[PDB]
Design a protein around this ligand. Sequence first.
Ligand code: 2AN
Ligand code: 2AN
Ligand code: NA
Ligand code: NA
Ligand code: NA
Lengths: 156, 156
Amino acid sequence: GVFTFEDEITSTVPPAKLYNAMKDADSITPKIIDDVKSVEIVEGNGGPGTIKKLTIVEDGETKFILHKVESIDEANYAYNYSVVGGVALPPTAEKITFETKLVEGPNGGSIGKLTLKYHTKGDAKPDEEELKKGKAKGEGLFRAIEGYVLANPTQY
Amino acid sequence: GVFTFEDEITSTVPPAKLYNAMKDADSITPKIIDDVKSVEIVEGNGGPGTIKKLTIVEDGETKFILHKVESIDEANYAYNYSVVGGVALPPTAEKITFETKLVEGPNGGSIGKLTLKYHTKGDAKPDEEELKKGKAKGEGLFRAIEGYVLANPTQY
Ligand SMILES: O=S(=O)(O)c1cccc2cccc(Nc3ccccc3)c12
Ligand SMILES: O=S(=O)(O)c1cccc2cccc(Nc3ccccc3)c12
Ligand code: NA
Ligand code: NA
Ligand code: NA
């Protein structure tokens, strides 16, 4: 099944900057997120369809995660990617899609919509703790990008 | 002369957690700020009076900022440091101090109480543009430390 969850967020950063920075995620992520060590393109040019291998550490152990870039829609400052392999897909999970869409906020910032689509195998539902973890990672990635823009204002 | 300015910024991060990040600047600053590559203690043991060097590489050229730790008060979630030399000190400034102390805020978050203390040479008043930069830097770094914490939720 597919189970969809939407959360509304804010940023003091304007949306075109966050959008441009979201596209440098491969460079930003290992800098800001301690446990992300590398991001390598397996296939593709960085746009939709691109497969990426992420090397992370969990408890001193190296683990590998696979991401796919799904779609980008610059018109709506929208960037979608999915987790397609590794530890975040327990046996009853097929894939998890993380969508981000941004609009201008009331004071030079942004209003964001973070959508999590949790794809299960057959009849299964998302485990509640797995959904919690997934939402945390998706928002954490958004906050890594935002934090990088806040710390490096001349770059966007 | 000395000229001082207060502001308050809210954070969703609870103060003990946010404070732990404030005290870990030597590790965090090179992670968040692209051009800051390392922090070296020049004199002292890390507490008040410690002099630190932030090593920067900007467009290929090595530079530094010098910091002095002014006060650390864990009980009241306070971490104060000064820029005392190098590229972050304008030629018209003697010293610029960035004070941060946290109090409990709404929803188990924090309010960061920021003070900028701008020390001029002799009888001059602060350069208005440098005051602007100093205020923006103080807020921007608070928001970026916060962002690092929100991007790394396990580390806390
Ligand atoms: O967990 S995942 O579902 O792949 C995941 C989901 C959504 C966004 C992610 C961004 C970076 C790294 C991931 N993996 C990761 C794993 C461990 C530590 C830090 C990051 C992300
Ligand atoms: O370029 S600055 O003028 O400082 C600057 C000005 C205004 C806002 C800033 C926000 C984050 C980082 C900066 N720079 C920074 C540079 C080195 C160390 C720490 C902060 C900001
Ligand atoms: Na790193
Ligand atoms: Na890292
Ligand atoms: Na750096």
